[PDB]
C-alpha cells in the first residue's frame, strides 16, 4: 500500500490488499464487495484515459492560441463553429458516435464478464490479438513498451488520470462563472492573484459586503 | 455525565435537535433567496 490520503489514523478496511494507486481513500465504503470494486476499477481507467486525451485539446491548443500562432476557437464554443462551415458534417455525429462505440464497448463489456473470451472464428483472422493479459490492460493494442517486469508504470497512468479529471471539472466550472477560457483565467491569477479568485469575482459564494 | 449524555440520546431530545435543524435550515433557506417556486 502506498501512503495514506490522511497522514493520520484513518484505518481502511479492504484497501490493504494490492491495487493500483491505493492510498486508502474510500470513506463511503463503495468498494466493500470485491465484484463491483473490480468494476469501478475499470471505470476509473476509462474516465482517466479518456479525460486526459480530452484535456490536451483544451490545453495544448489554447496555449498556442494565447501566444498567437493559431486562431482556433475555445472549447466552450468550438461546437457552434463547426456546423456553420460550408463543408460541414451536421448532426449524424451523435448517432454514429453511438453506433461505433456500441460495437467496441460491448466487446469490452463481455470481456469483464468472461475474460479472454473471444472465440476462434468469431472475427476474421485477428481473434488472437484481441485477447488481453488482464482486464483494462490488453496486449496487442500497445505496440512497444509493455515487456518490463515492474509493470507499475500504471501508477503514472492513474496519478496523471485522476489529475485530469479535476481539470475538466475546473474548466467547466471556470467557464461557467468567469466567462473566459482556462488559460485566460490563468494569465489573470498571475497578473492580479488576490483580486481574481473564486471568492470575490467568480461568483461561487454570495459575497456582497461593500464595507 | 455518562447518564446525562444517555438522557440526551433518548428519542424526545434527539428529535428536538433534528427539528431545530430541519426547520432552522428551511426558514433560513426562505429568508435568503426569498420565496422560490421554479428553480432557475
Amino acid at each position: 500500500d502506498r501512503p495514506l490520503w490522511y497522514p493520520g489514523a484513518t484505518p481502511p478496511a479492504h484497501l490493504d490488499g494490492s491495487m493500483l494507486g491505493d492510498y486508502g481513500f474510500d470513506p463511503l465504503r463503495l468498494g466493500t464487495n470485491p465484484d463491483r470494486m473490480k468494476w469501478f476499477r475499470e471505470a476509473e481507467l476509462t474516465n482517466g484515459r479518456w479525460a486526459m486525451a480530452a484535456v490536451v485539446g483544451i490545453l495544448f491548443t489554447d496555449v498556442f492560441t494565447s501566444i498567437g500562432l493559431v486562431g482556433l476557437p475555445k472549447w466552450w464554443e468550438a461546437g457552434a463553429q463547426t456546423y456553420p462551415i460550408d463543408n460541414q458534417t451536421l448532426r449524424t455525429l451523435a448517432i454514429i458516435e453511438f453506433l461505433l462505440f456500441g460495437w467496441v464497448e460491448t466487446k469490452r463489456l463481455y470481456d469483464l464478464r468472461n475474460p479472454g473470451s473471444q472465440g476462434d472464428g468469431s472475427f476474421l483472422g485477428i481473434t488472437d490479438g484481441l485477447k488481453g493479459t488482464e482486464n483494462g490492460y490488453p496486449g496487442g493494442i500497445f505496440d512497444p513498451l509493455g515487456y518490463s517486469k515492474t509493470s507499475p508504470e500504471k501508477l503514472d497512468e492513474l496519478q496523471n488520470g485522476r489529475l485530469a479529471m479535476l481539470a475538466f471539472l475546473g474548466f467547466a466550472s471556470t467557464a461557467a462563472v468567469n466567462g473566459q477560457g482556462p488559460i485566460e483565467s490563468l494569465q489573470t491569477h498571475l497578473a492580479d492573484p488576490f483580486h481574481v479568485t473564486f471568492a470575490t469575482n467568480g461568483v461561487s459564494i454570495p459575497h456582497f459586503t461593500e464595507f | 455525565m455518562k447518564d446525562f449524555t444517555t438522557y440526551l440520546s433518548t428519542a424526545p431530545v434527539v428529535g428536538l435537535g433534528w427539528a431545530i435543524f430541519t426547520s432552522g435550515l428551511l426558514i433560513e433557506i426562505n429568508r435568503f433567496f426569498p420565496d422560490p417556486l421554479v428553480f432557475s
Binding site: 463511503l28 463491483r36 | 444517555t6 440520546s9 433518548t10 434527539v14 420565496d35 417556486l37 421554479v38 428553480f39
Partner: protein, 163 residues
C-alpha cells in the same frame, strides 16, 4: 407556448394582479410616517412583491386566462418548450433526499440488530453511529444497485405468512 397558454410576461391579467397587490400596500402605507418601522416593513414587502412578479416572468412561466402561472409535467413538452425546472428537475431533487433517509434508516436498523438488546437502541439512539451513517449516505444509489445486483437487499421466504 403550448396548451393555449400565454407567457406571463405578455399577459395583461398578470400585470393587473401586480398593480392590485401593490395598491393594497400603498393604501396601507399612507397611514404611517416615512421614517417609522412600519413604513420600512411595508416598503420591504413592496420590494419583495415587485421581485416575485418579475422573476416568475423572466423564468419563462406560462400564465392562463386567469393570470396565474401554470406548470407542465410531461418531460417531453417540458424539455421541448423549456419548462424543465418546474416539475421534471424537483422530482430528481426529492428522490435523492428521500432515498438518503431510507438508506440511512435501513443501515441503522440492520447494524443495531446485530448486537444485544436492539430494542434499547431504538428508544435510546447511538448518536455517534447515526451521524456516521448520515454523512456516509451521499452516494446511496451506488450502494442500492450494489446491494440489488448482489442479492443481499431482499429476504427470501423467511417471513411470516398468515394462512
Amino acid at each position: 407556448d403550448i396548451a393555449g397558454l400565454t407567457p406571463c410576461s405578455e399577459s395583461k391579467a398578470y400585470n393587473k394582479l401586480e398593480r392590485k397587490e401593490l395598491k393594497v400596500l400603498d393604501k396601507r402605507l399612507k397611514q404611517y410616517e416615512p421614517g417609522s418601522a412600519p413604513y420600512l416593513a411595508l416598503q420591504a414587502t413592496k420590494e419583495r412583491t415587485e421581485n416575485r412578479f418579475k422573476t416568475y416572468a423572466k423564468q419563462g412561466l406560462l400564465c392562463g386566462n386567469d393570470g396565474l402561472p401554470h406548470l407542465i409535467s410531461d418531460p417531453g413538452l417540458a424539455l421541448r418548450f423549456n419548462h424543465a425546472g418546474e416539475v421534471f428537475i424537483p422530482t430528481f431533487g426529492f428522490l435523492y433526499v428521500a432515498g438518503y433517509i431510507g438508506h440511512v434508516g435501513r443501515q441503522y436498523i440492520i447494524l443495531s440488530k446485530e448486537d444485544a438488546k436492539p430494542t434499547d437502541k431504538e428508544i435510546i439512539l447511538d448518536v455517534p453511529l447515526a451521524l456516521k451513517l448520515a454523512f456516509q449516505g451521499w452516494a446511496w444509489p451506488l450502494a442500492s444497485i450494489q446491494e440489488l445486483r448482489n442479492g443481499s437487499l431482499l429476504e427470501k421466504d423467511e417471513n411470516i405468512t398468515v394462512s
